[PDB]
Structure formats: C-alpha cells, structure tokens
RNA sequence: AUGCCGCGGAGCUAUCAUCUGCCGGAUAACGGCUGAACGCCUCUAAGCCAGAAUCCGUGCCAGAAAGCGACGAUUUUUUGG
C-alpha cells in the first residue's frame, strides 16, 4: 500500500494529525483511530504493520482512503448538486445560513447553519438547483446529509438527492 | 346559657371571586454522514449530527442551626480594652 505525494501540498505526521496544505486552501484530520506507524521517505507515505490485529487490514484501507479524500480535497472540489422535484420552493438568503420556504405548503421559516468550511455558491443556472461548495469532504457530505434530512415527511411528492460535481 | 328578625363595615374565605405558572444540555428507540473489512454493499467497526411528556440542569422553596465572604462600631476621661 503506497501512494505518492503531489505537487505543491505540504503533508506532515504529528501525533497522526494531518495538516494538508495548499495554495487554495488547508484542510486538517485527526487520526486517533488506527495503529499503523506513519513514514515518509522524502517523496512517499508508507503504512507500516507488524502482525497487528485483524482489524488493522481494516484499518490500512481506511486510512489509505481518507489520506486519498484528502488528497483529492486539497486540490480539487466536491461540488453538490441539489435537485428540487415537486407547490413552489424557494431559497433566499444570505451568508453562510441557508433558509428553506414554502414546503408542502408550510408556513415556518425554518433555517439551517452550514458547517464550517462550507461555502454554497446559490446560483441559479439550472432551475431548482443548488451548487453546494466545501473543501472538507466529510463536513460537505455531512451537510448535504442534513439538508436532505431537515426536510422529512409525514403522514404520506417528496424531493430527493442527486448527483455531485467537480470544482478546482 | 348569643331571645328572634333585616341590613351590616372590618377581618376571614370561595374552580361561589381574581392573578400567575420558563428554556439549556445529555440521551433511549430511531434516522443519517464520511467510510472499510467481506475490493460490492451497508447508520458502526473509530468518530461526528439529529432525536421523547425520559434524565440532568436554568428558574422556584429551604439554607449546613459544627460551610463560607464583605462591611459597620469596638464598654469612656468612674472602669475595662
């Protein structure tokens, strides 16, 4: 299990806190979840095991993949296209706080706190869209999670996910 | 042994009269996120959210008579400090 380090990011092992870095932005992860020392060779990260535990070959992938999400994230986007089916909708608003009007013929202003790092560009090219921007890809999926589950139904039209994109 | 009757201030009293009676966290069931192993997949394996008249708190009552703090003057020309 090897994967090289691009060009231009600046990825340091302290106490398996991992503080990618970027000409476009910085991302951070804590990694108290695995037991597989750390090495760099000045050009590559190395996962090194010595007949650990079974869940370690768990615990490599693991940690090959959220290195990769990082990886991905520091350079490229993970934009999120939210798709509107249906009664109208509508979302205006300002800022990082994001309010949602008009569902199933409500009347309550309820709003909804975007978590850090998440920045939604709110444009308007496609008709009921949303383009959701965050550099964390844990945080953007956590938050499209919410968005999803804010609006639930009962006593049963609905609207649903759909899917992402690329910035950067 | 308040003789009886009507009205009778004050007091007492009446869901027979009037006034007043909050919001923060942690959760159970349960729903999700990134994500492997079991190269697929799945809320879970680590973690992070949401979540009940539940629990703990804000608030309300008492105040350790052997818990505590700040402040005031320290027997007046007999005598004591």
């Known amino acids: 299990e090897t994967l090289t380090i691009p060009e231009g990011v600046s990825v340091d092992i302290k106490a398996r806190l991992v503080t990618v870095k970027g000409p476009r932005g910085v991302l951070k992860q804590n990694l108290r979840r695995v037991d597989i020392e750390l090495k760099k060779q000045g050009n590559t990260i190395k996962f090194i095991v010595w007949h650990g535990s079974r869940k370690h070959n768990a615990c490599i992938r693991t940690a090959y993949s ?24 509508n979302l205006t608003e300002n800022g990082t706080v994001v309010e949602i009007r008009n569902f199933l013929g409500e009347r309550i202003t309820r709003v909804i706190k975007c978590l850090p790092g998440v920045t939604v560009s709110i444009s308007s090219a496609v008709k009921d869209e949303i383009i959701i921007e965050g550099n964390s890809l844990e945080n953007v999926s956590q938050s499209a999670a919410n968005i999803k589950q804010i609006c639930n139904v009962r006593n049963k039209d609905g609207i649903y996910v759909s899917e992402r994109g690329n910035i950067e």
């Open 66 to 89: 959220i290195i990769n999400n990082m990886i991905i994230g520091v350079t490229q986007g993970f934009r999120y296209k939210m798709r509107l089916v249906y009664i109208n909708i």
